[PDB]
Design a protein around this nucleic acid. Structure first.
Lengths: 47, 152, 116, 106, 42
RNA sequence: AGGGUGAAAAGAACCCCCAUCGGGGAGUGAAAUAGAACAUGAAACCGUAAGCUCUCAAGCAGUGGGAGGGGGACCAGACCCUGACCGCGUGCCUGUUGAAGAAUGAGCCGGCGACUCAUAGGCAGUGGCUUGGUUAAGGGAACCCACCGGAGCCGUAGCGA
RNA sequence: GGCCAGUGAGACGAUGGGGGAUAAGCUUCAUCGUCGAGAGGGAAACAGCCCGGAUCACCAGCUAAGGCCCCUAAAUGACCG
RNA sequence: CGGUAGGGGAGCGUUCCGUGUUAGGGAGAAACGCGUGCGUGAGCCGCGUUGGACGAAGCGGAAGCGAGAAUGUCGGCUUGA
RNA sequence: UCGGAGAGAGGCUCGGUGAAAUAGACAUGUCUGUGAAGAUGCGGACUACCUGCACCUGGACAGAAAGACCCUAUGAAGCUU
RNA sequence: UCGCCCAUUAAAGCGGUACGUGAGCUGGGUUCAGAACGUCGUGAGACAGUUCGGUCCAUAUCCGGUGUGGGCGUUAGAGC
């Protein structure tokens, strides 16, 4: 034969998982309405 | 405390006898009747038996003289065989190199035990469970109660 | 001024052994092998404390998913989480999953009034 | 509490992150109560129910049991051992103040 | 020819205990003969 | 290569096993869990006893989670021993571009076992003096040491063979 | 500029070339990435590819790269081929 | 605030000396073995058993001063059995 | 060819005495894949109660001797002109 | 090894397995020292040039195999 074959990191070049589909590349995080202001957490008033 | 007077630790030692070959024999008589043991040790086919036999009979005679309880009662409670003091001959071999052969020794110990010393106390506790006879605040339940010490 | 070592060695190797005194076989009773093994024990502890945080979460998610699928035929964890944030509702996965176990009534109640 | 949820019922204690500014015996109210429950339980639409505020008391601010952090790398003579006792706080829950809002449960 | 490692522990216990059980068997047989020694045998 | 019973040999009369050795009572002694193999007595290694626990398992032996069982003469949501079953986890060192490596080294356990000292040169930190500083040998009811010894050395002028 | 080090065997990948048979996990230079000296996640396992630079704790949360039948977290989701 | 070679800073212990023929100690020291104290760590600190007489601090000083690797070396004891 | 039978000395069993080289730790399967390119230990499968004794040597890059070949060292030593 | 040849025969297949297998065997070949021939070398010596002579270890720990037991398991225990 004369097809030298893919080995070492050259395998890892070829058969790495990757998206390569315009719609799947976009997307990102999901948007929301942020939130009304919340109270403290642990107010004291004692001793 | 649970015993202390149910025994006599005869410990015949520096016997010229490998420990493993002594443990062939002594593993059989850990917990037997003394009569039975003697019948075994004379008929057994071992060099190992003779010094063991001597110590069993010496221990039982010791127990009969010193603490004065019956040979027909007693048993072998704790038999135990430990490593002695090793001697080292240097034998030759072929082609000039030399190797050691060892004369091994042992320390044999036998703890005999009377069955019926604390039997008066144990047979009395044929009394069934929910009893708690509270006489001296707790008292003498000190005689190998065996089954549990769940006294919270 | 000759300085014998004596005391200083096994007073630390006792402490080394104190760790490994639940280990099985050679590892429990052999100085240099204990010293080799203790290190590895501590490393696997430190490594697995961070695995802990993600793995518990991953369990909880599966619990919640399992709980929520028993309601409607087509309703599923993925939708459920977005429906929580759609209504602005900051219950974390731990609470949700643990109530799903200990009080399924309450998951029924949360499921009922999130849909509307 | 410390960006960390807890189911909490009255007459009962909890361990938390060390509350910065809190005394040894000193009662406090937790105003981040995302859920309440009884016979007729009550979820929340938004966050916090509305005027529900849990009532508790600080007990003690002792440190946690030692966690041993251990950096190690293979063959590089890089053993680095370092303990860490995170400071925590013990708090005891006295009562839940009633909800008076959005009754769920069918 | 030569051993690669040592058996070390636990395995050597298992190996020795069977050998001591050989001793046990001999003890049983010798116990059995003592009763035969008592009474008859013609 | 091979030291350490005790203050004192007081080194075990007598009795039992018994041909010896050795052993158990007795006796001596503060102690004989100091008996001549004797003082403190670590580890490896060898057992004996108790709590739990393996015979459809696959495993650098741990680790996170923890079923069921057991506690410690001290009433704990606390703590300890075991550990059903799950997930993770390629012994250490040297030395390499790269080592789980089937590269090297160690059977295990305990000891011994390696950048030191003398004198000089540079530099830094610290101190003393700055009327410049400092003494060397040598002398001291020795050695240190008050107190002398200014002989020399360093700084105070360069330029040029 | 003072005092005082190690290094001077490199490796792979992208590109520009040389040598080779535009063979080599080959060799030699030039520019840059990673390893070397870098854990974590994706790649079944897999130094060198992709994501991302581990001060430490939390039985909180959002996401990158990559994924959503079961082993094994997430759609046995949708509409058109 | 990842980190090999490598450099810089801050410490812990070891025996011995000054203080000290200190207090503490045959109502139990050194040691030896255990701790549901402490510290970032080297390590520290209290315990009652075994042990049977030595000897902490603190402030300072000096080194035969810290071991797992040397086919190291001496002694003990395994494995093969 | 083409083996067969028998005698001794072993081997095997019982009692007595009792070594050795080796040994990081060993809870030490097969297949194919992976990786310092030839794995009991890494991935996926397959197979497999626990434990002796007798026999057999394919593997543990089995043991033995810091390769005696090859090359290096401004190493050593013999011999020649 | 390969090869050629004789007598056959249905046929005298070609390869992998560390050019399978030396802790299974052999030691004829090839890598030690002796000695010789041709040759190269002033010489010591040299030459996949040739010739004669020349010490092949091992008691199986583990995996793996061929046999063969023992334990336990199979839910009360057994013999068929």
């Amino acid at each position: 034969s004369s097809r030298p074959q893919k080995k070492g990191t050259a395998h890892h070049m070829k058969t790495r998982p990757k998206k390569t589909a315009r719609w799947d590349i976009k997307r990102g995080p999901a948007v929301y309405p942020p939130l009304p202001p919340l109270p403290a957490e642990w107010t004291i008033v004692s001793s | 405390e649970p015993g202390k007077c149910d025994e006599i630790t005869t410990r015949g030692y520096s016997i010229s006898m490998s420990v493993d070959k002594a443990r062939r024999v002594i593993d059989q008589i850990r917990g037997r009747s003394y009569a039975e043991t003697l019948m075994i040790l004379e008929l057994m086919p071992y060099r190992a038996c003779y010094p063991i036999f001597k110590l069993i009979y010496s221990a039982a005679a010791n127990a009969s003289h010193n603490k004065q309880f019956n040979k027909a009662n007693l048993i072998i409670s704790k038999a135990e065989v430990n490593k002695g003091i090793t001697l080292k001959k240097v034998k030759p071999r072929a082609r000039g190199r030399s190797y050691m052969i060892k004369r091994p020794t042992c320390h044999i110990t036998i703890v005999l035990r009377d069955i019926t010393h604390f039997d008066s106390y144990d047979k009395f506790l044929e009394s069934l469970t929910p009893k708690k006879l509270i006489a001296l605040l707790g008292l003498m339940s000190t005689g190998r109660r065996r089954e549990l010490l769940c006294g919270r | 001024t000759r300085v014998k070592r004596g005391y200083i060695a096994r007073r630390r190797r006792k402490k080394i052994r104190f760790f490994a005194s639940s280990f099985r076989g050679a590892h429990s009773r052999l100085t240099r092998t204990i010293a080799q093994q203790k290190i590895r024990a501590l490393v696997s502890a430190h490594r697995d404390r961070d695995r802990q945080k993600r793995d518990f979460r991953r369990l909880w998610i599966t619990r919640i998913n399992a709980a929520i699928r028993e309601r409607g035929v087509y309703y599923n964890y993925s939708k459920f989480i977005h429906d929580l944030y759609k209504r602005q509702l900051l219950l974390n996965r731990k609470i949700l999953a643990q109530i799903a176990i200990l009080n399924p009534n309450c998951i029924y109640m949360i499921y009922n009034e999130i849909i509307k | 509490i410390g960006s960390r949820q807890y189911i909490v019922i009255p007459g009962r204690w909890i361990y938390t992150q060390r509350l910065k500014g809190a005394t040894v015996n000193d009662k406090i109210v937790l105003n981040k109560v995302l859920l309440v429950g009884t016979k007729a339980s009550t979820y929340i639409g938004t966050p916090i129910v509305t005027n529900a505020a849990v009532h508790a008391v600080v007990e003690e601010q002792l440190l946690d049991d030692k966690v041993i952090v251990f950096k190690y790398k293979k063959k590089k003579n890089y053993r680095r051992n370092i303990g860490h006792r995170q400071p925590i706080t013990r708090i005891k829950i006295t009562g839940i103040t009633g909800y008076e809002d959005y009754p769920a449960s069918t | 020819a030569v051993p690669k490692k040592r058996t070390s522990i636990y395995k050597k216990r298992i190996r020795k205990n069977i050998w001591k059980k050989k001793g046990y068997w001999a003890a049983l047989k010798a116990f059995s003969l003592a009763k035969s020694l008592s009474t008859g045998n013609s």
